[PDB]
Amino acid sequence: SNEIYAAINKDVLIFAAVPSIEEMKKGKHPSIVCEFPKSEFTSEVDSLRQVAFINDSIVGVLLDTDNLSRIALLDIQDITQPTLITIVEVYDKIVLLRSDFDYNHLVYETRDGTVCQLDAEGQLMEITKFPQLVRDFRVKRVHNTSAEDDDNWSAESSELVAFGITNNGKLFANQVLLASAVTSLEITDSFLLFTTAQHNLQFVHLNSTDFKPLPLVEEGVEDERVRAIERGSILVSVIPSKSSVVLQATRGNLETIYPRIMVLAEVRKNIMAKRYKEAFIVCRTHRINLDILHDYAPELFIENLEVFINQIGRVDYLNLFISCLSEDDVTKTKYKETLYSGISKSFGMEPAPLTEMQIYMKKKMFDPKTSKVNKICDAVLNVLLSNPEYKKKYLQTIITAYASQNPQNLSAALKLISELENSEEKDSCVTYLCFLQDVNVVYKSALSLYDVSLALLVAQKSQMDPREYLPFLQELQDNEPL
Amino acid sequence: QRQDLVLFSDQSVLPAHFFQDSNSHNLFFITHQSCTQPLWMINALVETHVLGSPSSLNESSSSMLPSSTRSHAVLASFIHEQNYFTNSLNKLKIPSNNYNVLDFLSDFIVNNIHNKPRDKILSDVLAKFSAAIQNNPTDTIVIIEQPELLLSLVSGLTCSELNNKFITPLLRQCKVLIIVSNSDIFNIDEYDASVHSSNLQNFYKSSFIKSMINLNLNPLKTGFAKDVTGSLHVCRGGAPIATSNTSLHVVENEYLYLNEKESTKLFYR
Amino acid sequence: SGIAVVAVMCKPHRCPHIAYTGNICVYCPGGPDSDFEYSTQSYTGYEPTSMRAIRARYDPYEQARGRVEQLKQLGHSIDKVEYVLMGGTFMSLPKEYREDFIVKLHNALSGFNGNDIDEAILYSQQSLTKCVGITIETRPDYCTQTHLDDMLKYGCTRLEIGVQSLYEDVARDTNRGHTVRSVCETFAVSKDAGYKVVSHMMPDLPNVGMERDIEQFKEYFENPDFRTDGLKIYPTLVIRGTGLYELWKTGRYKSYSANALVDLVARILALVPPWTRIYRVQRDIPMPLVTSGVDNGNLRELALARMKDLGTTCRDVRTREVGIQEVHHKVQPDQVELIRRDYYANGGWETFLSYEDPKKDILIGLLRLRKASKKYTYRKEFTSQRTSIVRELHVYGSVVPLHSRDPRKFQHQGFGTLLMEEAERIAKEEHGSEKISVISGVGVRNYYGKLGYELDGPYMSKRI
Amino acid sequence: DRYIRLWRIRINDLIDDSEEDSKKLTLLSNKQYKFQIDDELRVGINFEALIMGHDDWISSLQWHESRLQLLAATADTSLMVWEPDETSGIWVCSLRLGEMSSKGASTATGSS
Amino acid sequence: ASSSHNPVILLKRILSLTESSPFILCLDSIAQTSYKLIQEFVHQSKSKGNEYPIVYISFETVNKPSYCTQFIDATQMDFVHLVKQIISYLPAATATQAKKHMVIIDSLNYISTEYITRFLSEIASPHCTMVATYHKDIKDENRTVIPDWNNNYPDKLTLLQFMATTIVDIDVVLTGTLDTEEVSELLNEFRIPRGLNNDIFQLRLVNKRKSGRSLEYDFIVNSNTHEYELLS
């Protein structure tokens, strides 16, 4: 819970504690409370080297003789001398020691290359042996589920997996070889990160068991398997709550970056809960394509557009997003689910843009009933045009919907403009419509809707000759309507 | 910083089963720019064949004396002499008794090759190795060093006769052959050897066609630095691998190497 | 667009640090005492700006007006100009001269014809042809708090204080009047005021080896004291009139060859932190009068070939800039991300935010933020509570095209707002500040007055 | 901006009309500024003409007594006299004084 | 006309010896060696079932080819012998109704030009199919010929291009960061960079017909699955 800390001096152990995280964020300096001598529970045995914690209530210590390396355990208490619990007798020497992935038990390594796990009440069970002596290792609970991208909901049982890296820098699974030379590794929920000797940040999604060696390093990934990072930069910490990774540079300054995969996971999670405001902010502030809002689930949007409109009260936000629309599947070119589906495949092969002459077949293919843009426009139009109050709040949205088609209904836009009680408001609408489209065609439509004021008001911005619009209206303004 | 030296898919430089397969042959071709010398690689090859590991780069060299080992090694050269080979390679501690060393420089020039028919010279220079390898037939490695110089020695010899009289019989008789040479002929500034000096270059091109692996030691570009000496290239030769296993192939990578006090270091850019 | 740099000149004078050492610093060429004698120090008087200054008898009004009109007539139209001053130590001169100089330089563009500099700057705020700051050259001995207040009132935005070395014998043997360590406190006091600070270096100097040259730069970039926002590298060239030529005449001096210098530059460029802008390794020199050294017109043109042969190419701002609009938009860019770095420099924590492409390492926009400390701040604005300062806003993100679905007809006009709100987020959450301030030139005091910042003294600030 | 413009002003009973209640084409730049000053006086102001053709910023405009002429001084020391054009309706400069080339006390090129 | 309406079909008919070809020539270099095309012959000409004696006459090769059924070493024979100890294995110009075999020559660069045409005269029969590769990076020996002003005759390349009825050129497809200019340069000073000698290669086909002009096309050939793609 990040409120208890233990430090070992010689012959005494010191425990410090804080009331809460918020108090530390307020300005309460950490308070030292517990001071426990050595002769109380050990009687001056040789060594005092390491220490570890279990779920805020168990503290483990290593006491080493010439060859025997006992592990002392204490169930914590208050300031008054936390009592001793059974210390075990071990017949080997310990090298490394950590906690487990959820702060429940302890894991440790012997001087031969064997990792074993022990429980908080003297329950012992051996785990694994390593193919080569290592300098670092990490124990992780791999879910034993069967789905390749974990699309199950029964939450099947899990198994303990302990990785490792040698002094030469070769990343190892339990018994699986990985990239030849690396220098770092960090594991969190379903996530593994490691930096090779070429210093590329490479990701691993923990799906299930049966690991295999990773492929030869290649150039570029469409998914988030491979990212380029500065030289000498080892990893420091991972914060998936904000989709961030923090690392240490070689000269001694911090750095923090946000790889695309964890941001995409966050936005997908926000989508699943029918929350269309936080996802918008996340997708915008990190320069993520806005089509992914519902391009990954069209039917949900077709049924939830009525609340999509209500959740986002900013007119400009809606205008931006609807103008931010394309037709392709952003789920297949930018944000493929191959971020975590499949293992041991070929890499991204950084794509190239299409040659221009071979795109026009799609242009000639276009009909209103095929494109996503037209169906989205019709949906939002019929949703908004069912209440005059909503029109008088998103006229800009309606104009954008009209102008977001190949068969643009600019005539309807000018019809909607005509009914305003104001002149400068009509001017603002005219300017907005001129932003998206050429003034020439707008003037053509203004002529085609049989009115005189609108034509000249559009022609003001036409930047054409005075003689283009003087005599035409000077004749039109006078005669009979027929 | 330091990186391992791997030259095959089996994560081994010199596979042992190569010596265990009968009815097979293989050829390695090594080229060094004559501003540097590949001796520190010949040593590694010999150690990894005999001791089974690179005993100077990746492994310590405190027990480097492979004399009287179950394996064998045969080296022959023209550029230097028997005296240099013994004194130096024993100061480099390259074995002696489970080993064969051949000179063709000291006292060989003086009317032992000169003013004699060419056919006898070629026959005898072939018979030297044809008799020196009869003892141990299937646990030896043989390396020749810069044999093209002999072309300039024999009165009027082209690439074809020398090749078919010396090189191919040697590889047919022996299991595996390693040929090392230098490439200054391709590095004359503002002069074209393709004008009339193509006879020697024919040998290089023929060897690269016949070779299986190609090792290149080349100097740095425009300038000269302190922390790095040269560049190391590995490439697939012309001929295919004559092994019996199917998954075998060659790894493809480039190294930067520094040499200092017989100690070599390899790493990446 | 229309960014303009119009250099001006001040009347000749003598820097007083000569007084306690006897002469000018050894490498300084020319000067009033030299044969030229109508020229400010460190300039031979043969530069085109020197010619334009002499014919005007060293008057700021005429120089500024003439250069502006010439630039306008050439074919470019100007609406954003930044002034730079040159020559000696401008701050040494008496009180009235600097006031009149600044008032003239602002009234040249504003069109105003008054006095009482407060009114001049007040009118210059509401003027066309906006000014985007000044660049004043000054020495460590003249950066005291009173002078800093003067510069803040004038409208200056960034200084450039040279150090020329970090060893201690060089300071006395080059007749430069300041110990090296005092420059650190100068940087510390200057930075807390929001002044971007740039330095100078010269690789080869008398009684300096190639080694010492290497680790002096290494210590400059590594030590948390010599971390500054810019650099200039001046290879040592020997002009006949300098005190350097006497050493060569007496045989007490020798230079480097070409290979040594190109190797040194290649090594140096492979260490630059990614928040410092290497200004000019290929500086501008009086060519024919040099007697010792090597050609410097294309040093980097060969250093690049060197890094392509050793690896780890440069990472400065300049090489990674894409520009305001269509400089390298011939190809559609790649993945765009936000990168945030933090470092400790001169008794304080500072943050550098940027919008970059990580696959190919280009740069689009950047921002700098500093958390004010307690042992260096003295301004009555910054001595009332905790506060943070935006030392520089830089938006080349005025680019129309982009990668990852650029705005169609909005074309990144709200791009800067992203960074501004990003800065405000960590100002409110991490710094725990109660006031945020931004420094800027007087001509651009409105691009920041729309986001809510209100004016106090020379600063644009808003609370939390 | 180096341009000189004019504005005509009329009292009531002579103010230009047909702007209101008449089918005419109103341009963007020909707007008429009318104001009811008091219960008995209304003034109409309109734009007349654009005069240009100078090398720097205008500094002094002065009227006359017996002519429709103006005196224009620039920052280039040039002097111009602008007079009405009875033939083309757009005023053309009458006299141009100060062709001497002099900038400051020391003259190199141009004038100032 | 109504035959070989697709270039791929023509290539496969040539490869599998469906249509007889008295002479075929293949060009290669150091940038891409030419022993994969023999694999193409072996694989394609076995679908029709040609187990007929695949003689492999060799001048330089040290190893014995598994894919072939014969092995002849010609480092000790002269011209007349070399013709004579091949007519036995091959269906020599007797038995006017008989089968056809396969001939693989490892190298053409070791033979003097003076006999070239005769090596195609004493053996040319409707029973034999000569296949041989030509390395273009080896310049032959010309001191013996003494090319003075009165001792002249055409060079080997033109004779090889003339007496051939089908010509195929081999090239290595560029895949990574190497282009033709710098590749040819580095080969000139012999640095041999990575990005050479792969199985996926490219071919240029020139097929000659009687009483008419030949046809020239290009192909992309893979040596893994034995599949082809014509030039776009």
Ligand code: SF4
């Ligand atoms: S301080 Fe500047 S002006 Fe003074 S002598 Fe040194 S370089 Fe010249």
